[PDB]
Paper text:
Overall 2.81 Å and 3.06 Å cryo-EM reconstructions were obtained for Eg-SC I + III2 + IV and Eg-SC III2 + IV2 respectively, using a mixed protein sample purified from E. gracilis’s mitochondria. Altogether, Eg-SC I + III2 + IV and Eg-SC III2 + IV2 have overall MWs of ~2.6 MDa and ~1.4 MDa respectively, about 1 MDa and 500 kDa larger than their opisthokont counterparts. The divergent structures of Eg-CI with a matrix FAS domain and of Eg-CIV with an inter-membrane space (IMS) helmet domain were clearly revealed from the supercomplexes. A helmet-like domain next to the cytochrome c (cyt c) binding site is also observed in Eg-CIV, likely contributing to the specific recognition for its endogenous cyt c28,30. Notably, core subunit Eg-COX3 lacks three TMHs compared to its mammalian counterpart possibly due to the evolutionary pressure of mitochondrial genome streamlining. The leftover space is occupied by TMHs of the nuclear-encoded subunit COXEG1, which introduces additional NT and CT extensions as parts of the matrix and IMS helmet domains respectively. Functional purpose of the Eg-specific matrix domain is apparently maintaining the CIII2-CIV association solely via three matrix interactions sites (Supplementary Discussion). Among them, the Eg-specific loop and β-hairpin on the NT of CIII2’s UQCRC2/MPP-α wedge into a cleft on CIV surface, formed by the matrix parts of subunits COXEG7, COXEG9, COXEG10 and COX5C. Lack of IMM or IMS interactions sites between Eg-CIII2 and Eg-CIV creates a prominent cleft between the two complexes, a feature not observed in other eukaryotic SC III2 + IV1/29–11.
Residue numbers in the entry:
A (entry chain Qb): 80 to 395
B (entry chain 4j): 1 to 88
C (entry chain QG): 1 to 228
D (entry chain QK): 31 to 91
E (entry chain Qa): 1 to 476
F (entry chain QH): 2 to 86
G (entry chain QC): 2 to 365
The structure:
Amino acid sequence: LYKDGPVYENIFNAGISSFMKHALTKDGLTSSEYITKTFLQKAGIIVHEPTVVNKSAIAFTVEGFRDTLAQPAVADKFWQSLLFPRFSPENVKEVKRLVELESKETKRDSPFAYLQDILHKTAFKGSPLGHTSFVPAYNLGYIDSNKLFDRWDAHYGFGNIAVIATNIEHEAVLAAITDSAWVARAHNKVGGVAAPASKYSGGEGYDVVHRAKEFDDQFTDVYSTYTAYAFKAPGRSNLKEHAASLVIAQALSNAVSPVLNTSFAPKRLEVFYQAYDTVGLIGLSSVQASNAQLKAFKAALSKIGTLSEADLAVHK
Amino acid sequence: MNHERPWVFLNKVTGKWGACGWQPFWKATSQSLNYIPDNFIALRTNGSWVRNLWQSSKVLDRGLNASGYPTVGTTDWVRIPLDAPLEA
Amino acid sequence: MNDAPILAKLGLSKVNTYYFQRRKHIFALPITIPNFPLAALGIFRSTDMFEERTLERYSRDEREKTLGKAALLLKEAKEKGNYSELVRLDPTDPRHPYYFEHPWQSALKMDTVSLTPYQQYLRWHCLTYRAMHEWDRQGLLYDDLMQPKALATDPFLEEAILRLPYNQRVERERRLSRAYDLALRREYLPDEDCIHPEDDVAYLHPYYHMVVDEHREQHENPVDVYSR
Amino acid sequence: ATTAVSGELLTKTPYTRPGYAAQWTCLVVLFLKNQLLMRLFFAFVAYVVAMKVFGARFHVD
Amino acid sequence: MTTPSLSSILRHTRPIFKETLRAARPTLQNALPNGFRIASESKDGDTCTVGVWIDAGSRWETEKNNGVAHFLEHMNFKGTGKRSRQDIEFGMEKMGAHLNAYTSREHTCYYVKCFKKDVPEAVDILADILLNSKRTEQDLDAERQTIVQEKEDVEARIDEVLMDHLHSAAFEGSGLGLSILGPLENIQKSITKGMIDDFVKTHYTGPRMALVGSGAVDHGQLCDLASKYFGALPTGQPKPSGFTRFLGGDKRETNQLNPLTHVAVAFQTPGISHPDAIKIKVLEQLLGSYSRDKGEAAYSCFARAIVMDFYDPKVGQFFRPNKAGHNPIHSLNAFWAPYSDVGLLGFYAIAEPGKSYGHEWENILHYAMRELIRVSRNISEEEFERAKNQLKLQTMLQLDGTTNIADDIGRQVLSFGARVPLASFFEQLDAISREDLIRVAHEYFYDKDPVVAVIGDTDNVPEYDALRAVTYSVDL
Amino acid sequence: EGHSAYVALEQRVNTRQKGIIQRHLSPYDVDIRGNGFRQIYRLGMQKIRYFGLIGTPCLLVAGAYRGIWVFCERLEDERYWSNAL
Amino acid sequence: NKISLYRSYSTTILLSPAYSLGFCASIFIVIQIISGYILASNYIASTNESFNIIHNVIMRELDTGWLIRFNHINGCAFLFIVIYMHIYRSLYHNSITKTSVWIVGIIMYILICGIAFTGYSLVYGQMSLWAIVVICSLVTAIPFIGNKLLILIWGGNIVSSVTLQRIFCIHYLLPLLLILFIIIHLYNLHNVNSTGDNYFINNRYDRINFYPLLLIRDVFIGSNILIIYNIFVYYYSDLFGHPDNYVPANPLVTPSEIMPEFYLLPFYALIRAIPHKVLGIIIMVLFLLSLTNLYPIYFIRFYNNINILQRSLLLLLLLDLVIASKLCLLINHYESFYLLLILSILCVLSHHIYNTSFNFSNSI
Ligand code: HEM
Ligand code: HEM
């Protein structure tokens, strides 16, 4: 887990983390992309695409039999990637192509994910949680090797790296990430990065795109409008309130989604609960939404408010 | 070589059973002094299928309701594997 | 050389690899044509000692030297925490692991005491044979004359040119166009503008060598023997 | 024109471009080291072949 | 790019594969005298998946009732003799669970995830919907439009449409080559209560149904419930045993406005119960997969052969260099779709259409077919080992969660008659010989008729005739 | 011309050119004698020096061949004059 | 659109007058084609009428048939001279980098040698007959199928009228294939452009339009070389020939010295300097094949620059070829010149055209 994401960007760096998502996975100083990935893939290890988790960190995840992951070579390759980058211009060009494709595909094939991006962008208007998770068009030309190196220097530090394992005995993990010579060859420094808090607007409010004029209609949906109706909810800071919010979200989701699911049921609704540190969103994203529908959703939430201990047992 | 482990045919309407398996065979010639043939009918096994067949004989001859076993083509024969002893 | 202290502290030689060049084979195979029959075999060879010798980059000693210099850079980076700076030095910086010098860049200020008679001849020849071609009177650098061709291209060379910084690429192109304009009339730059041998820097060979190594990388770690 | 390990540029060593006599001597020496032995060997082989195979005599009476 | 690349000079350390073999509790199985099967795998926990797997998909339709299986699936949820739709939904909601129905070409399943205390009620509801559901014409007429909307929605999934094209091309004249939902004209007018009742009567029989339990479940309790509810099923006629002929050919949909081109090339293979099943699985894992995020880091000879021609400078002696501007491949994936009778083993490539009348797809298919021939002729030991290890891991990766374990149990029970213990499976995986794998590869790939499905700019994708001429080489 | 190998090469190698200013005079404003004698002298001197350089090995080998030719010619004359053929 | 005509093709500004040799060779190809077509319209190929129909009909019944014949002869000689200068310039400027152009040029050179030989065979004189006999005696040294092969080439045990007729058909046919190969030569060149005095990669702003400047330069150089050519046509008509070809062929008598034309002499030397006939044939075939650039094919090869040592060695190659020609003619009477003949031939065979970058490598 590497600490970098939209919450750490500004209006001039918007999307730089996305480059960092891929640039670190491309050729480094001490191991190219061909050497690492193939060496991991030929060892029966599934190498996942790096992801941004809570708009605040980049996860590089690897999956395989525990015995294959406990050996100190996989962790060594990850250490090499994170501590000795290269940021070659040709790799940066490849990353530019990849980020363009990611934005375009998410817009075309994941309209609900794009709607979530808009929801956050307008929800937390002048605060770090309102930054964009996709590279804006202009920055596509601006971000290059020098900017990437400056950001890497700013975010450098073993305090910005974490290791998380789920089916490996703890000691073995410690035996794997501590046998690397490259960690011993790296500048020793604990460097933290901090971001401010957030407030919440969102709004009766709008991102305009004529999908029918942008994409071919046969294999994508082009005649629909995506409405996200969201409210402020507690984050993960308080475990009691987080659990209460989980119960509320499950109650709302079960009261809207069909109970009897068929094979080819279409995706028209989603009840989402995005939880962050000390703030969150809970709401309903839908297509062809209506005032009656949104009023019914609000009334359902209010009704959930008045439930008793006995009535809360089912939803719990 | 790797073929199927020995099995037991069982005919339902007639109610008659019998073991079976794949017998390798080759043209006869001189043998080898330093080699006792391994298990060839049931490859990579400690040869327990004989014990399973001996134990299961009483079960099968007594009358077994093998409707939960696969058939062999369109005939009335079903295959019972001899991986583990048959009790039902 | 300007790399001499670094090469000395690592136990290597302070003398250019232009010396120590030697013939090891009788047949120069694969036999290449156009070449008259005997000359195709390569029994007798004609060289002016200014050949590229690119295939000799495939050696363990060169790798050991490169990794020694890289280790010095990484040790400094650990000491001071200026990693990025040190991994972004220009290849014309003597501390760069791929720094390369032309023989004439050090011929006028070499010790020459540890040189055999043949190597002293090589030094004199390098200087005078450089003087014999008059690319310095055309305002060019030797590395400017490494130009790819339309057919049977030198792949590394092309890539080596795209790795250059933009300004240095533009300056190379402008030098070439000025030399072209001069060559129209077979004119030379004013005598005071003659390139000093120590100014004739090998600014493209480090990129050439880095490209060669990177291209051979995937061959030494194949996915499978039959893969492409 | 390249800097020293300390990062400064030193004064260029004085240099006088070699003259035509030096260039001519260099080319003569290079040619001789390239082909003197080769051509002597070929002359010897030609003499042996002519005196033996083709029956040339190279002496009178 | 002044920064050197030390990876080309350094000596790298190679990780090696070492499997982990956790002993799972054996899968118990019993059978009622009716033949209905009951399979169960128990594990420590608090939640369990209980379901019914039925061996009647859309494979048994003759274009007069195509989609009747899906219509039946939708009709089972509209109320029974005892309960109504509202009552069923209320029961599920009180249990806090969802009832999922999935319909495939040769399998259907109705499953519920619940707590161990709701197992009897879940089994009761499953039996109620499966056996006692009343399917009247009025309700049949009230679901036609929802199914039409589902047809229009699933027609918009490019991958599903491509696989439907592949099956329609490969298996023409048999229900295995028909779409699951069926023709629109069949949805709106043809399918009737008579067809639904005939389908249910013919295919919902004892020996073709299993009750599967996974997780914190009791096998004895499951058996008692199964006898209580599922003991009265008829011992109907056996599963049809016909000949499904494979027809090499092509199904190409032209849509030049699409941003990506999807091409699937498949070859005929024997069924899932054939002894070559494990060898075909190892072949599938040998061809491997590739995603664009990897770049040149393709771990298989196949994908790599197709990828490095977009990084090769292609410098020649008498011709100018022709290097691609960028890598256009979005993904390559080897797939195997087996069925009790037949199979489709092949590759699925997604890449940009490219410049009109270009050579990108010509090169892609050229190198794909060359690699097929090469593996038909010779396979390396290191890649053989890689393929076997990847098959081990892939087989293990599919058993995440009680629902996935139950799905595996049900599919294997319906196909092979009983679940194969993983160790036993692995026992057969270390006994495969490289020569046997080469023979299997040569039997089904070399000089055989493929089936091709194309969606996208067919202006650049080669036609069938050319593709038929590259399954063999003059040298051999 | 746009689909030619040398155009492809110039597009691959050279950047997008910028900051180049060219001045051309029409031939009606240029004197054909303008730079004639100076160029004649310079080119003559250059070619004299260059041919003096690259012609030396040929001159040396031709001298050796001339020695051999004289020897063989007078040997054969002596052979013919004495009926030793 | 005259502008579109100007800019349809552009070259470098470093095309010195030495780059008109291709145009001169084109002029002489045109001259040979026209003169040969006029001669063939008055030619009968047989052992009873050939020699007579050239000296008694062509050169004495027409107004300027003699002029046409002298044009044909001296045009062949000057075509070979210009082609040798063309090849020498191509080697001097390292033009082997133009791989297509070079291979097509070598094919054309072999074809032109064949055309010249077959044409010289048509004058059924003493030298023509006996040159045919000697070359065919070279043919019959092939192992196994040599003798039969020779018969198929001659249609009999001796040179006869059918032999002359097939030679005439070959001589007529080949120059037109040569024309097609010249077209391919020019097509490849226009694909890769010209080197010039020095090799540079030029953008359109550094190049100049081919038309009409280079066409006018070609006209100027062509007129000068045509002056030189016509000095030989009218005042040295028989300088590039052997007088024994004015004696009608006598199969019963062999000339004192059988000598080919000056432009084939080097090849003849390669046969006199190798005592074994089979070895000489093999070495000639390897020589011709080695002038090409057809190997390696799938090994990465690229070309570096050329230097003063290589240019001096090229001059040495010219010297050795000339000496070999003269000596191979002189060895008939004087046997002590075998030493210098063999020395020059060995020196020729050991000349490096392409500097093998593979000269330098390391062992495993
Ligand atoms: C289609 C074009 C050509 C035709 C029809 C042709 C035809 C003839 C004919 C009929 C003769 C015999 C008449 C005579 O000897 O004066 C002849 C002689 C000859 N041709 Fe050609 N010719 C052609 C092209 C060439 C070419 C391209 C060359 C090579 C430069 C060439 C070289 C010769 C030579 C060397 C002779 C014998 C010279 C001599 O008579 O002493 N011809 N040609
Ligand atoms: C009939 C005989 C030939 C004709 C008519 C001919 C014609 C031409 C012409 C018109 C050109 C372009 C103009 C020029 O650059 O001089 C040319 C270029 C060239 N020719 Fe030929 N050629 C002939 C024989 C040969 C031969 C035997 C070779 C040897 C392989 C050759 C190799 C070349 C090369 C290398 C060039 C390009 C030189 C450069 O620009 O770097 N040609 N030829």
